Amino acid sequence: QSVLTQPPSVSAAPGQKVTISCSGSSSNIGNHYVSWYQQLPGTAPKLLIYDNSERTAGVPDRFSGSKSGTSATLGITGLQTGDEADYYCGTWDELTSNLVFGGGTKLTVLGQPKAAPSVTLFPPSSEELQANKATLVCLISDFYPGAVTVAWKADSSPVKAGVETTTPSKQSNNKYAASSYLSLTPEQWKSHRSYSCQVTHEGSTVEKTVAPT
Amino acid sequence: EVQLLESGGGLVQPGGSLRLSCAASGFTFRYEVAAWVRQAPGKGLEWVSAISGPIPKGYYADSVKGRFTISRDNSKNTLYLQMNSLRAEDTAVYYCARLRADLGLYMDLWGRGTLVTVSSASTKGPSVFPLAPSSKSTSGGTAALGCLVKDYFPEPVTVSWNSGALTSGVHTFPAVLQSSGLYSLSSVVTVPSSSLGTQTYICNVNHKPSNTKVDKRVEPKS
């Protein structure tokens, strides 16, 4: 999926306010009504908003929907910790004849200070290269909120294939961890000057780089 | 006063078949338009199938048309999805939902969800590789070094340092589930910059289901 564009994460303190954008085309949001779904951890999505701005029974006015041109917004004011969910927009696409969805937005209600991630990047072991294999390991620790985007670079070029990234998970000290794995041939590894692991947390990037010695 | 409960999900091989159910209670599903939507782990929602009108008629996403068949038993007040010629990419939690229309379309009731896992992975043992500490070995800060645990099934695996002795620094990261269907994880330990050419770090890895114990040395580059 991900015909519709959302931000991957947003955060504000309890009592404070936030909005979540939902960006589409002329053939979906442009000509069709947007719905907003709330998913609490380990639970089923719940309809908050339908026909752009009609709240379902029980949903309070601080949850507000709006739509203009080919975009839609979810406003949440009076943030409580019970708001901590993944939020999805959805509508009809008259190009593909599909019900379509955004990629979701992880909402965090700040209970501790903003903490940026520590990144450690390991190159392929001497041993693994003998086996005709190559793995780079990007260890990502001590970030809050618990949402990161990970982008790998070959020299400066975007790498798509051979990437496996975990979902963020809770460390014993209440901060979040994640890891990222890039698979290469030894010819790829040895035929680039550097590979980089790039971790975006709250609009700011932490980059680690290695090189074949 | 109204809910949906799915069942039938679990583990199946590539090229395999599987049938999910979704029992309604507190309303008559029969007169309602019903739908299946799915979530590949840590990703968005994909619409799969929908069944409407009195005939009835089925609608499908192109990513499933000719493989999946939606139906309902009005007697058991239950909705079905028959899934044929299954692929690794069909791996996802599957929700049944109630679809209604006013000005536009919306899904106003969702079920609990159910996991569907499509892989070949047999009870395989891991390959362990040393993660040597950066030769950059700076006076300020300290030395990160670890152990890579690659391509195993199923969970879990156990990781220690010097047969228990060393727990001062240890971070053993949750495992990644690969498209291959195999698991990988790594364990890093932050240890003093100095006393590196003297101190002997062995990571000790055990995978029960495969019957695999491995001890790996971790020294810097030459």
Side-chain angles (χ1 to χ4, degrees):
Chain A
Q1 230 314 344
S2 288
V3 180
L4 308 178
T5 281
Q6 308 187 231
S9 42
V10 301
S11 71
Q16 302 203 352
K17 155 270 210 313
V18 77
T19 61
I20 316 171
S21 64
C22 177
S23 206
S25 66
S26 175
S27 65
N28 42 57
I29 300 171
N31 268 282
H32 301 284
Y33 291 91
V34 174
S35 272
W36 292 95
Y37 303 92
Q38 180 187 61
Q39 183 163 41
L40 302 156
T43 56
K46 160 166 176 199
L47 181 58
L48 293 198
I49 299 282
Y50 70 100
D51 301 341
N52 293 346
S53 55
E54 302 299 314
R55 294 157 247 259
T56 55
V59 176
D61 282 353
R62 61 185 196 79
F63 284 90
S64 154
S66 44
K67 143 76 168 58
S68 186
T70 51
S71 266
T73 287
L74 185 50
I76 313 167
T77 62
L79 274 197
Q80 304 173 6
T81 79
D83 296 357
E84 285 203 90
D86 291 340
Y87 290 85
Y88 293 93
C89 57
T91 193
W92 180 256
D93 201 318
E94 77 183 33
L95 188 55
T96 43
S97 272
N98 293 151
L99 281 164
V100 291
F101 295 100
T105 312
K106 198 223 191 312
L107 167 66
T108 305
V109 188
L110 298 163
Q112 58 190 257
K114 238 89 167 213
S118 278
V119 178
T120 331
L121 180 64
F122 285 118
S125 79
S126 286
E127 189 161 325
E128 177 181 32
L129 288 168
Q130 314 297 349
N132 189 31
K133 302 294 192 151
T135 313
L136 285 54
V137 193
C138 194
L139 306 182
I140 328 184
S141 49
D142 301 331
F143 55 99
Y144 182 88
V148 288
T149 285
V150 186
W152 287 91
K153 304 307 170 175
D155 291 320
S156 279
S157 293
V159 197
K160 290 303 133 184
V163 179
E164 312 278 10
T165 308
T166 64
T167 70
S169 94
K170 340 93 193 57
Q171 301 175 145
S172 87
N173 63 331
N174 294 309
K175 287 138 144 50
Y176 287 95
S179 47
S180 194
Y181 293 95
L182 180 70
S183 290
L184 295 183
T185 75
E187 287 86 8
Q188 284 187 282
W189 170 237
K190 286 177 138 61
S191 282
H192 295 87
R193 287 288 299 172
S194 82
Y195 277 82
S196 302
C197 179
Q198 292 176 0
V199 189
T200 305
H201 179 81
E202 309 284 316
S204 331
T205 287
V206 191
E207 175 165 83
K208 243 64 191 321
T209 294
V210 286
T213 299
Chain B
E1 210 81 25
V2 129
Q3 60 184 310
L4 296 177
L5 188 64
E6 34 284 85
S7 57
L11 181 77
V12 57
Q13 292 280 292
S17 261
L18 188 79
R19 187 231 219 177
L20 302 171
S21 330
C22 167
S25 56
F27 77 104
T28 302
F29 226 170
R30 173 181 188 188
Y31 309 125
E32 223 56 75
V33 183
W36 290 94
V37 186
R38 68 168 179 200
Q39 188 169 53
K43 307 278 284 210
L45 304 170
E46 193 181 29
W47 175 72
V48 166
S49 195
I51 191 166
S52 105
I55 293 165
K57 274 160 82 211
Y59 308 84
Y60 308 95
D62 279 28
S63 55
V64 306
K65 197 183 274 90
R67 298 167 54 246
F68 289 18
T69 311
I70 192 160
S71 54
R72 48 170 149 77
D73 192 324
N74 289 342
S75 286
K76 293 152 84 110
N77 196 19
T78 315
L79 170 80
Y80 299 97
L81 188 67
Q82 186 65 58
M83 298 186 278
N84 297 301
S85 306
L86 276 165
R87 298 159 184 177
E89 40 166 15
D90 293 308
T91 307
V93 168
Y94 286 70
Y95 306 104
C96 65
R98 194 169 66 187
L99 171 63
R100 283 178 176 167
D102 195 353
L103 271 25
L105 307 186
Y106 60 89
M107 273 147 293
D108 67 340
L109 185 73
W110 295 70
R112 288 234 188 96
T114 218
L115 186 51
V116 166
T117 308
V118 181
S119 258
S120 161
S122 314
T123 57
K124 178 161 212 174
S127 307
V128 174
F129 298 112
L131 295 169
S134 64
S135 40
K136 277 139 281 155
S137 309
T138 46
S139 179
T142 213
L145 56 96
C147 255
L148 173 60
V149 184
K150 204 178 118 172
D151 293 321
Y152 65 82
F153 192 93
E155 284 263 63
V157 56
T158 79
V159 198
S160 92
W161 292 84
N162 319 96
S163 316
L166 181 56
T167 74
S168 223
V170 169
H171 195 337
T172 285
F173 287 76
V176 62
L177 183 38
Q178 307 180 79
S179 51
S180 81
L182 274 29
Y183 293 83
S184 296
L185 60 76
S186 319
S187 178
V188 70
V189 58
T190 323
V191 307
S193 322
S194 71
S195 287
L196 253 193
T198 79
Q199 186 59 14
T200 277
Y201 302 92
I202 323 300
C203 82
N204 314 82
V205 183
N206 180 269
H207 185 245
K208 151 150 281 176
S210 79
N211 184 114
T212 317
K213 215 209 302 174
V214 190
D215 299 11
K216 193 62 53 166
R217 337 92 217 179
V218 179
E219 65 184 41
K221 312 98 188 272
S222 313

